[PDB]
Structure formats: structure tokens, C-alpha cells
């Protein structure tokens, strides 16, 4: 089960993840990346309906073996807070950013807020796959995976 999103050049985009939060539990959020800059065409990761032997059939993104070997897992940003209040000016969060991937490319790091990642000017260095994780002090863990590719490749 993965989300399919289509973007266009010079048009902004945003990714939001389903969240089921409970007040009073200290919470941590993590964002990741998985690029496809060197993985173009059929070698690029693609959505396929992977079916089990008899019971389970779900959508999953398949990545080429060479592309996977040329791809390294990276951390984009980490957020820590505690759920409280209804507004947003009453919610403080602590952010840790160790993402050096976008520093060498001389690009703009994405704008990350609780449950939302936004990019203003889409380029060809932003395409790929994103992994989002939420953990808590009660032992709860939730995972999600987004996929952003070029516009028009869905039909093909």
C-alpha cells in the first residue's frame, strides 16, 4: 500500500501523512529519502500490485537492483514534541536536521512541519520516494511511503 502523486515542473507540491495522535504522549517524527536521479526509465522504481500466494494483494514500489545498490538511505529531518492544544501557536517542537544530501546539490531543503512536507519550485532533483515514520513513548509505531515521479508516466 503506497500513495501515487503526480507533480509538474515549476509547480509546488505537498505531502501529508495520516496521523492519529493522542494527547500527553511524547512523540517523535522522522522523514527520509530515496532518490531516482540515476534511475530513469524502466530502471526507475514503479508501482506494482504484488500478490501473495492465496490471500494478500497489495500495491508496492519495486526498485531496480542496480538502482537500489546505487541508493543509500538518508535522514531528511527529525521532529520531537508533545501533543497539546488545538491551535498551532501553542505547540512547540524541536527539530534536528542532519540532511547533508541537499547541501552538496546547492538546492533548497524541503519545508517540514508536523505531518506536512512542502516544496515550492519542483525540479528534476526532487523525484523519488519518501519514507515517513512516527513513534511514541507508549510503544506505537506508524509507517508510510510516498512516491513522486514525472507527470504523464502513469499512463505508460
Amino acid at each position, epitope marked *: 500500500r503506497l500513495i501515487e502523486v503526480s507533480v509538474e515542473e515549476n509547480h509546488p507540491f505537498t505531502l501529508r501523512a495520516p496521523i492519529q495522535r*493522542i*494527547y*500527553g*504522549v*511524547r512523540y517523535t517524527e522522522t522523514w527520509s529519502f530515496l532518490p531516482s536521479l540515476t534511475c530513469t526509465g524502466d530502471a526507475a522504481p514503479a508501482i506494482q500490485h504484488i500478490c501473495l500466494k492465496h490471500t494478500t494483494c497489495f500495491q508496492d514500489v519495486v526498485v531496480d537492483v542496480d538502482c537500489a545498490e546505487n541508493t543509500k538511505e538518508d535522514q531528511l529531518a527529525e521532529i520531537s514534541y508533545r*501533543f*497539546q*492544544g*488545538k*491551535k*498551532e*501557536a*501553542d*505547540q*512547540p517542537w524541536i527539530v534536528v536536521n542532519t540532511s547533508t544530501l541537499f547541501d552538496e546539490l546547492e538546492l533548497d531543503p524541503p519545508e517540514i512541519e508536523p505531518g506536512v512536507l512542502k516544496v515550492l519550485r519542483t525540479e528534476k532533483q526532487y523525484l523519488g520516494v519518501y519514507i515517513w515514520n512516527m513513534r511514541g*513513548s*507508549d510503544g506505537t509505531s506508524t509507517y508510510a511511503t510516498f512516491l513522486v515521479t514525472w507527470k504523464g508516466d502513469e499512463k505508460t
Partner: antibody
Amino acid sequence: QITLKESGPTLVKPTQTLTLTCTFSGFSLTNTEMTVGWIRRPPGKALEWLALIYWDDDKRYSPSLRSRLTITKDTSKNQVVLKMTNMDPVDTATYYCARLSLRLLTFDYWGQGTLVTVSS
Amino acid sequence: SYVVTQPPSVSVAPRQTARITCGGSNIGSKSVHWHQQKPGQAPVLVVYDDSDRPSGIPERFSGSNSGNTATLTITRVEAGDEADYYCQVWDSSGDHPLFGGGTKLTVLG
């Protein structure tokens, strides 16, 4: 229903130590939405914040009187204890203990408070 | 730290409308609450989280929150409404509650 009561001494000599107890019933601190706080009132002055305690032993202390406070909790017997040392004559007041919910950030339930007086 | 200021004293002639303001730099985005207490009594809550009502609270109290104003309005005022009112906020820089200076209501006439 939520019930809160306060207990302790009433006379404190100058520069000694003061202890007070706030007891609660109707809820358990094991729930992750309840906090217990302490505040005070001088003669005809503003309601001043003193301290706040969470479920996970976190502490929130007043900026003005940070160095001279201690607050402890006991979930087994549903008790909260406060220790305030080095009393001063101009600190005579009435002290209150109250409950706070993390879903509204405002104190909802209060007790009756008790008098604290310094004299020789 | 956030700074919140309110006028000290306001007097209203009998049976009229009284409005008490809690104001501060960009106070609309923050939640502001009202606490009421009579002399020699335990304080009571009346209005919490931008103008809703808890059980038992009188209906003559109304709250508004916009811009740089949080207004508490009481209509059909008796002598029994003479009490001390406070506006409370959650300061985010220190992550702690903050009270004001208090307001006193005078019922002449």
C-alpha cells in the same frame, strides 16, 4: 466527580522550611492528560503561579522562584507534596492546588486552599 | 516571554453591560481564558478556550477573540457580579501557564 483537598501547618517561623499536601480523588494520574499544579495569592495581589507536575515526573517551575521549590507525586496513594524552604514574612499568603488538562491549557478544577502565615 | 496587560479597574452603573479586555501583541492566535473569584472564596472558571460554556456557568457571560482583543462581556449586571476577573494564557517560550494582573469590577448605583 473530582475532589481536591489541602492540608498542612499554618504557622512558619522566618527562614524555616514549609511543607504542604494536596490530595485528590475521582481520577488517576496514570491517565496521560492530567497535571497537578500549585499557586498562591497574597493580600489583594495577583494569582501567582508556583509549580506544575506531569505524569512522567516532568517538572515546571516558576521563573521568579525557581531555585527554592520542590514538588513530588505519589500515584499509589493519590497524593502530591510540595516543599518550599526559606520562608519570609512578606510571603504570607493563601495557597491553592488545582488540576490542569493538556487538551485546553487552562485550570479547570480547584481546591479550597490554606493559609500560610509567618510570625515570631 | 509573552506580555499580557489589562486595565486595572472598570466601574459600571447598575443593570448595564460590562466589557473586560485581555490584550497583547498578536493575541488572536493564542487561546485566552477567563477565571473568576470573589473575595474570601475559591476561584471558579467561567469561559475557556475561546467562548464555549461549561455546565452551570451563567449565560450572561460572552467571549470574543480576534486580532489583539479578547473581550468578556456581561449583560444584566447585578451587585453579585462584583468580583475579580483574570485572563490566563499558555506562554509557549517558557511552555508554562501565565496569569495577568487581575481586574476588579465595581457595581455602583
